[PDB]
Structures are given as C-alpha cells and as structure tokens.
Symmetry: D2
Subunit: 388 residues, 4 copies
C-alpha cells in the first residue's frame, strides 16, 4: 500500500517546487521555455505540447484512477473529442449508451454523419443489446455510469470483459462519481475520462477535461493527439482544478451525507411518485452500485406529482438550490430536464427516454443538511397547494 | 435564517446582476466610471471599496455575527488597522504574555515610539488580569487558544471585566476560525483573523480581516483601512472566498484526524506531554468545550530525548511538511526552538514553557491512517536515539 | 468608425453594467442561473458562451472587419475548428508548401484517415495555384508572410482566383496581427490567429481565434467549437485582451527595432542573406508594402561559417533568448535546422531552402541600441570561428 | 555595458526560472516554504516577509530608479505609510508640499493629530517657504513633482541639497512621471515611492505601491517595517504589475505623442482660458521640467470658459474619455476636480488652491491622437453652445 486516495489528492504537488521549496506549486503560465544552450531542449519547450502546472494535475488524476498518465483538456467535450481522434478511423464502429450525455450524442452524431466512424446504440444494462453490438466487432465501447438523469448503473466488469473478448477497447465517462467513488481502470477499462468542470474542480469556476489511460503506450498517443489537435487546457485552469481536487474527499463526505438525508425525505413522500438514486434499496442497480462504487454519490432525480404547475410552484421560492445546468459544485443546484437538459428533444423522444414533465434533478451540495431539507419541504408544500 | 456552513457555501452564489453567473465575477478594476457628471456609483476606487473584497467582508461579518468586515493585505495588517483605529498616545493596550510573536514585535515597536503604552498580562490568572484592568486600558487583546501550548482564555470573563472598566476588547480568532469560535457572541467589540490560515485553507493567500460588532466602529475601520492603505487585493479576496466555501467540510476532517493523533500521542512511551484542548487533562479543557464548537486541529507535544530525538523524528516524515504557518489542507510540523521562537534566548524560551523537545502539528485532511503510520515511524526513529 | 488602435485600447472600458468598472470583471463561472423557470439568460454554460471570452472575440472581429470571432484554447485548435466546420470526406484542402509545421502535422494526420484530401501548392507561383484550383478544392489556406523565409502571398490574386472556382479561403494572419494586415478586406472568408504570439504579446497565454466575414459561417464556427470542446479559458481571454490593448504601442517599437536590425544585417560581411519584407531586394517587397500596413518584426538571416559560427553567435547573446515561439515583448532567436525544422531530414531542409546557417529573430521592444550591440558581438564571435 | 532602462523593464525576470527554463516567471502564490531539513531555512520562508514574485518587481523598480532595493506594498498609500513608520517618531517633524496628493494630506493630518510627528506644510517652489520649514530641523521632507492637478514643478536638486544641509532625509513621490520619465535618486534623494496603480501597472487592474531606497541600510529598515506592519502586496498583483511594467516605455511614447497634440489644440483655443502642462514654454516650471524630466508626460489640466454649465455640456457626449478618478492607464480619462478629486474641500479652500469650477484634468491614454482630438473638439463646441 502506497498512501490512500484522500492522502494523494490532498498532497498532490506539496513539496514539488525545486526553485524555492514553495508548499503550493508555482503557476507556470509561460507559453515557451528556453533551450539549455545550442541544441539542448529542456524537459518543456512549449505549453500547447507540455506544461508543468498542467502535468501535475495529469499526474494527480492518473494516480487517483490507477493509470499510466493523464492528459488535461480545455473541456470535458474535448476529452471525448481527444479519445475519438486517438482511437477511431473510418470503417471503425463505436458503441454508445442509449442514454449517454446529450453533448456526447451531439458530437458522435455530427462526426458519424461525416463518415469519421460508424455508431451503434446499445442499452449496456441489457445483455442482448450489448451482445448484438459486440457481434459487429466494434473498435471502442463507451460506458457512462451512473447515467443522467435516471442514475442507471452499468456493470463495469460484465461490459468490459465482454468487450475484451471481441477485441474492443472500453472508455468510461466517470464524471458523475469522480475517481474518489469509482475506479473503472480497476475493472480493466482502457480509458477513463472526466469533465473536471464538475466534482474534481468542485467550485464552478473552471471548464476542463481529463483522460487517463491504463497503458503507457495509449497515454503517449493521447499526448500526441492532444498537442496536434490543440485540445490542451490553460495552466491557470489546471492550477484552480488541482486546488479544488485537494478538498474532493472532504467535499464528497458532506455531499453524500446530504444526499442520503434528502433521499430519505423524498422516497415515499406523498408528493413524489419516484426517486432515482442508487442509494435506495428499490433502485434498479442498487446492489451493483454498492459493489462497484465506494459510495452512492450526490446526484439524484425525482418525479413530482401534479403538473408542470407543481414544478413551477416547487422551483419558485427555493432559497438553497440554484436553477441551473452543471453539477458537482459545493453549491446545490436544481435542473428540470424537460425545459433544460433535454429541451432540444421532442416530447415523444422524452417519453421514450423515460423523462417526465414532473422530473427534477438535484445536484446536492455541501450546505447544512437541515437547511436543504427545510428548503425541499417548503418546495413540496408549494407543489401540494397546486393539485385540483 | 440559515446555518453558518450554508452562508459560507452560498456566499457568492446567484449575486451577479450582469449575467446571472453562479460564481461571482472577479472585479480587479482599480477604478469605476461616474454615472454622468457629479454621480459617483457605489464604487469609485478599489483602495477605498471593491465588490469582490466586500463579498468576503460580508461573508466573514455574517459568520462572526458582526456589522461588517474589512479585508486587509495580511493578518498583521488587520492588527495594525485595529491599533491605528482605536489607540492614541496616552492610551494603554493590554496584551497576553504568550501572544503571537508577530503581534508582540509590532506592539513593542509602536510602544517603543510612544504610539501607546503596553501592559503584558497572563489573562488566565485573575490577579494578573485585575492589575492590568486597574490601569484603565483603552483596549484589551485576547488570543485563544495560544500558540504553541494551547492556553485557553475565558472569553466571557475577560470581556465582562474589560467592559466594567470601559475598555474595548479585540479577539484574534485565527486559530479556530469563525466555524469553531465566535467571540462577538460573548460581547467582544472586534474579532480579527489571519485569513492566511484556516479561512483560505490552501496556503496560497496571505490576508487578514477585522469584524466589528457595532456599525460605527466598522465605519471607523473602513476609513482607517483606506487612509493607511492596508486593504487587500481583489484576486486574493476571490481565492479566500473560494477557500471559505469548504471551511466547514475541511474542519470536520481536520478534527477527526486531530482526535486520532491526540489518542496516539497522549501517554505514548516517547511523549512526555501533549498540549491539546480536547484532552480532559489539559488546563482549559472545560472552558474550550464550552466557548468552542470543537477542539480544533492544532496541537503540540514534548518528545523525549534531544534535539537528537527531534532530528530523528523529522528526518523521513512523508506526510508532514517541515514549515511555518498552519491551517492548510496539508499536514505541517514545526519545531518552535529552531523556527517560530528561534529569535529568543534559551532561558526566555524556558521562561515561556517552550522546550527543545516541543513539536507543533498543524493536522491537515489527509487520511488519518497515513498520518498515524507517519507519526509512529517518527516515534520509533526518536526512540533509538535514546 | 474610430481607428484600430482606439478600438483595441478601448475594447474593455465602460462595458460593466454591474459596477461601472473601467476594466471588465473576469467571469470564471462555468454556469449561469436561469432567470426563473423556463427563462435561459444570454449565457447558460461557459463551454458554449462566456462574456469575458466574447469580449475578446468581439474585439478581434472588430479589428479584422468580420461578423464575429471564436476564441480557442490554442492556435492549432483554431485550425482544427476550421477543418471541422468547413470540410468533410470527398472535399479537398489546398495548403501552402511552406505552411507552419503544426498545421502540416494536423493536415497530414487527418488526411491519412480520409477526413479530406490535401493538395500542396506554392501560392506565389501562378501555375501551382491554377493546377490546385482546377481540382475544385473546398478550402484554400494562405499563410503570409511564411516562416522562416518571409515569402509574401498576394491575397487579392489568390482570393479572387479561389472565388472563381467556388473555394472558400482561410488566412493564417498570426505573423502580422490585425494591426498590420486585414485579410477580410481582400475578400477572405476566414482569418485565424495564434493569440499566443503578438495579440497577447507577453508569452503567458496559449490561445487561438477565428473571425468569419459572414454571420452565417460565424454561427457554424460557434456551434462546432461548442460541440468539439475547443473553446478557451476565460482567464486566458482576460490576459489576452489585456495584452491586445498595447498591440499598437508594442508594434511601433517592434518595427523600429526590426528596421534598425535589418539595416545592420543586410550590409554585413558575416551575413549571406536576410529574409525581411522591408528590404527592397526581398522578393515580394512591393506586394508587402501594398497589402500590409508595415513590414513587421520577424526576420531570418544566413550566417557565414555554418554550424560552428552559429554556436559561437548564439553562445553569449544577452538580449535574445534561445527559444521557440515569437511575438513576445522579449527578443527571441531560433535555429530552424535544430529547433523548428529538426524533425525534417537534411534533404527536406535543403529542398525547403532552410540552411544550417539560418537563424530566425523575433524582435522585441528592448532598446534598439542594446539589440544592435548584442548582434554585433554575436557577429564578431562568429567571424572569430573562421 | 549595463542595458538601458527600457531593456531592463522588458527583460525583468525573463529566463530567470531555475525549475523549467520558463521564459515568463512562474507566479509563486505560496504563503509558506519548506525548510531544507531540520534547522535549514531556505531564502524564502513566509510570503508576508519575502516572496520571489514580489521581489522580482522590487528589484526591477530598484534597477529603474537606481536604488539599492525596493519594497512592494498593497497600495500607494501603504508605501507612504511605510516611509512614515520607518523614518519618523514623535518629536520629529515632516515637511510636506502645500498641494500634495489629497490621500497623502489625509494620512499626514490623521497621524499628526495623534502626535506621531509634528508636520509643517510649505510651498517648496518658493525659497522663503522652504528656508522657513528647513530652519525647524525636520527629519524628513516629502517632494511631489509634478503636482496634481496644476502640474507645479519642484526643483529636485535644489530641495534635496537644502534638506541635506540641515540633516533631513528626502522622499520623492514619483507616481506622476514614473521611473521612465524622472529619476529622483540621480539628484541625491534618499527614497522614491510610487502608486504602481497608475503608470507602472498601466492597465487599471491592480492597486499597489513601491518604495525604493538609495542606501542598502534604509532598504533593510523598510523591509523590516513592511513585514512588521503587514503592508506587503499580493504576489498575484506583483505578477500583473511586472507584466504592465514590460510595456511602460512603449506606452509612454504614445501617451506623450497624444499629450503634445492635445496641448496644442487646447492652448490658445477660444474656449480655454489656461492650460496646465509643463510642455508649454509659458508654464511656470517648463525649463525645470525640461532639465529634471526625460519628457513632459501625459497629464494636463485646463480651464474651460463658461463654468459648470460648460463643463456638463463638455463631458456629456465624450466617446473616448471615461469620466473617472485615477490616471496612468492605457485608456483616456477625464476628471473634474471641483466635483471629484477636491469635492471634500470647501469653495473658498478650492479658490485658495487655484482650483476653479472650470478646471478639467486629462489622463491622456494611447488611443489614436485623431480620435482623441475629434472627441475634444466636439466637447469644446458643446461647451461653446452654453454661454
């Protein structure tokens, strides 16, 4: 045993500065680096290609995920973009979950429409759906678990071992739980990627991505493609994101305490028809989440009884949940998928995906449990006062 | 009304009128336009007032229960600000005998020039207090707990006795932060912090704050901070407010680690004494359980053996950085005889109860088991020099 | 309107509805609140749109004369964004033979996969252009001046010929900036920059930008940049706009220094050739005097005495840093055979006209007198190696 | 050879990173630094007391001013504060100019009123007023040249020599011109200080100060006091200030070209009764300014005919001059001292100081001269339509 994940994140680049013995590593904004005399390139030459502040974050995420190295991108979508370009070429097929992130679907549909690769859509929680995708010999399979907004759990070990038997690489989008709560490379995944925008940064003030490869050689291909495509991130953003990472463990202990309390209030409340939260014993994939995850996390959804009118009343005076997109911040957020995250779909597509007009998504922050519960009770009470 | 943790977490949030930004925009601007001829806006010049700095001021004022907050470039600056706003020649200041060494350096320099007269007292000894208060001081400074032996002063007792002779009280609440101690609750006039320590928590800002209970004292601190040029950078205030949002989340881990470490060290064969207010045997325990919401994560202990034992302890620590400061997410160790108190005599240090075997821990938020493994290996290395 | 200097200098000022801040607040926020149920504001998510980023986009669109700008995390991302917005399999792209090596690496990697076909051309040779355009390409890339031999491509010639066959044109305007060359005034569809170079000017941001002449292609670039995740950091936009405000003031000194240095080097017994569009003997001088507002501050020269003369020249330089990149306030030198073009074989370098004697200067804003004393002592060192 | 001042500012901390060879110096935000094993303090231990990013800026300004070192403070007022605490004690007297910066005056009056030192105000341009202050044996003499907003010039060599004859230290507030246009240590001053908020930073996004001492022993006393009073600045601010410093020389060339064009429009214009600008041969101080300054700067004030109604019509449609306090940024600003900088004063106190209701102050930025002249010509027509 090296150290734990909390210790490694908390101590990422403390005692890393050879210049001054600075406890927090200096921010290397510099675009360029001098040669050490004629013909002698130093370790760094140009920030698009390699930068020490960015590489510390890379190395800290590689260490938390258990991989050979990390590449840091300017956005989470850029991390997805990077994998598509390093791994696929025309004639290859990519398998995508039916309920993957809408930005992931938009990018996959736009590039497949040009013939960059072919798409197969699959429900990775249905054995026959997976088996039919894999019988086509795909190059790459994407897993996103838990799914958003219904928190479907995909069985990592099942999917990854079946993919390997037909020679497919697997990439897991581990954004929702972070490396502190789920380690897809422990199950044999080739790649794991994140939007650092979310939990890893935690403070809603950086947009970023990361890809971690299990194998050193795929890592080197990602470095080369990130440099060639211009997808690397800002050193300043890497600085703020490493700062946020240091409290990821301390933040998640409170996030998950709050989510367990909120799930208790919402589950079986008279105004709530269903709760989507892997913590609940009646959630499909509960047992699988209890084994492949180190906690149930702090995202959940619930269907409020009554109309769009009950929703408008619920959301109307919330004091401690901000109506917004994104998630994983220290501040609690609420989103209405039908008018926000899934507004571009038709009504008919939403009913097929199992997204109701009554569905609300919570990103539970680290405010005091007592306040979040008072706020939700007064929201459920405003909603109840519609109803005719 | 919301809890202190909810107020700290939501201090920035959905307060941007330009764009609805969730996180408040950073206002670096030194200057602001007039709204046409003769119409000053709320802000005109960053030295005097700045919205990013005022957000941190307001957050700290809300957490301490005060009427407003002033943000200074350093903690020493915050102490400087109080001395200039409150004292003038002829007035006397009462200071704790074991106050922070930076506070003592400033008090001595300004007293030696006659800005005010100084009385040093042991505020935990009622006779030493009553003798200082009988000299009608204008201002009494309290620093509790003390650094590095964690002496506890009775806030309600000193504040009432100060108030009975017409003195103001100022509490330096750096060590515990507003999340673990609230000196304005007991009637203190002023509370100040080095935000360098727990409030920022990430070892990347040096800063201070002053919160006044009364609106009229707050207005006097704002005028003096502007006139002396003691106000902080808005970037620093942005990073400090960012740190503040996790203060509560961090202190829960810090305190869990500190409880586990105190239990390893207390009565260990290589440890002669642990200074930690959480121990029932520590003088100040009961007072600390009453006036603090937890016992914190600073402690000191006396290692048996030399300086030789201290050198072997420190050589090879993987998870404690040997450095000054405290209150960061990363565990630190310091040796007062060679670091914080090295600028003293052997017998001045012996007079203050500071041995060559004393080590101070600032316990961070790493996993307890890693920190306990690291400390048990330091104690085996020290045993072995014996 | 107002001039380009005025528009760049004033691109921040009086834009803050919240406080009237003279310099615009840094909007770091990843997200923005809905105004209430069902009411998205102007901004929702920084990957798609951010006000600090859009101010820089708008300032660059205004300097280039375009409908709008997109800001990328790097210059290569800007090239990437254009390739994805404009091309698909079956389309062909025309590329200059001497284009930037990062551009060539990206075009070759994506062409090897069938994303599009490549035609290489010498756009200074009418027949090389005519033969590319007779294939009906979808897009023509122009990079003028070229690096490191400062070849000038005739914008009006290339653009009017591309338009007759229905090709779109994109110009990489990195070397001169919008202050010195406006490709959209000649009819180009797109102009792009590495903002890492002159626009930022302080060597502390990597970034790119694309400006479209037409509102409809602008809207396509916005959509692809969002979908591909190529948009830049708000903080980087803030520093880049800060740099832009001095672009005019910087370029006046850059170009005075470069005229002075060109005068020393073109003379000189130790210099076989100077590549600088300001010299009357440089091929394309007259064309550069008409399509550019100045000759700029990049140049190359061939030092007599091959590699040993180069090592002695470069060895004690005090005011030129041996490094890649360009467009900084600080003077840089690079040796293309061992630095920018090291990955080519000796035979490809000889075919591209890149000698072992070739040195490239990125001339800064240091005093002309200092840069000349430094270059004269480099030329003595070199001569002492014969 | 040494290099010029422009070359030193441009190349300040270029290729000085020992960790990576970074061209641009890494920003050291760290509050604390590790000991190199038991009992081995590194060069840096605690950012309040010493930080390498702040020390880079210190050293650059010391090199430009020709001094032994620099201290960087959180504000310019802080830099003045630092000098008062390092140099004076009760019983000492301070001589200040009658038209010093209003913040300097507020601080001098507050600390004098408490008895930190005695205080004498003198007109340092009038030899009798100077000789009477110096005969009272002051410890310290403050010079501010040029003055704001009437651009009065004090003879640096003359006041410094006379201060030295009676044993007084001199401190020059060199904010207005910056080290690029005036070097008070060349004439024998002990101290020079700046608000870096103004020209040195140049981009209106940092408030800061600096103090440079000629002698290494006074520099070490300013370092000790700055640490003890907690007056030191943010390393991020120092990074942004050093960034701005790199263009100071390039900016001032444009500022000065614009100021020369604007002075020529305003001087003898039908709507202008007087221009205060040391570049004019008619300005009292012109010859002194040509001798002790490398250029005439880019601050000026002028008296508009027609009082307050003319001023309101003048400022109403200005497109390229922002109505605001501060100065020395890349963007042109205008201020009206009677309603802005001197609004605190009374009408009789402002009349006494020569500040009319018609006085406008320009901070001329680096926009194209022709845009600034068109804007000012249209303000002068709007003022003239008043009347």
């Amino acid at each position: 045993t090296p150290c734990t994940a909390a210790t490694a994140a908390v101590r990422a680049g403390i005692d890393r500065d050879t210049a001054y013995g600075a406890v927090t590593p200096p921010i290397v904004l510099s675009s360029n680096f001098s040669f050490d005399g004629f013909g002698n390139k130093r370790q760094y030459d140009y920030t698009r290609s390699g930068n020490p502040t960015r590489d510390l974050l890379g190395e800290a995420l590689a260490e938390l995920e258990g991989g050979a190295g990390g590449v840091i991108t300017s956005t989470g979508m850029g991390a997805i973009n990077l994998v598509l370009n390093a791994v696929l070429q025309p004639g290859d097929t990519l398998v995508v979950p039916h309920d993957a992130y809408g930005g992931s679907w938009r990018l996959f549909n736009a590039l497949a429409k040009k013939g960059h690769f072919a798409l197969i859509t699959a429900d990775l929680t249905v054995p026959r759906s997976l088996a039919d995708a894999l019988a086509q010999s795909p190059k790459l399979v994407l897993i996103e678990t838990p799914s958003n907004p219904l928190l479907r759990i995909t069985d990592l070990r099942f999917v990854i071992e079946a993919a390997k038997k037909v020679g497919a690489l697997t990439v897991v989008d581990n954004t929702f739980l972070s490396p502190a709560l789920q380690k897809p490379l422990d199950f044999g995944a080739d790649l794991v990627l994140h939007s650092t925008t979310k939990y890893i940064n935690g403070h809603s003030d950086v947009v970023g991505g990361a890809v971690v490869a299990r194998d050193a050689e795929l890592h080197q291909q990602l470095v080369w493609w990130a440099n060639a495509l211009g997808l690397t991130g800002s050193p300043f953003d890497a600085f703020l994101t490493l700062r946020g990472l240091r409290t990821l463990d301390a933040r998640l202990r409170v996030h998950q305490e709050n989510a367990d309390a909120i799930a208790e209030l919402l589950d079986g409340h008279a105004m709530v028809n269903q709760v989507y939260f892997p913590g609940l014993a009646t959630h499909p994939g509960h047992a699988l989440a209890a084994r492949q995850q180190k906690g149930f996390g702090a995202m959940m959804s619930f269907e409020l009884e009554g109309g769009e009118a009950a929703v408008r009343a619920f959301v109307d005076g919330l004091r401690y949940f901000t109506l917004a997109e994104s998630l994983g911040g220290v501040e609690s957020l609420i989103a209405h998928p039908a008018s926000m995250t899934h507004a571009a779909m038709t009504a008919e597509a939403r009913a097929a995906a199992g997204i109701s007009d009554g569905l609300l998504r919570l990103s539970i922050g680290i405010e005091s449990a007592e306040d979040l519960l008072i706020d939700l009770r007064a929201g459920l009470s405003r909603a109840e006062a519609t109803l005719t």
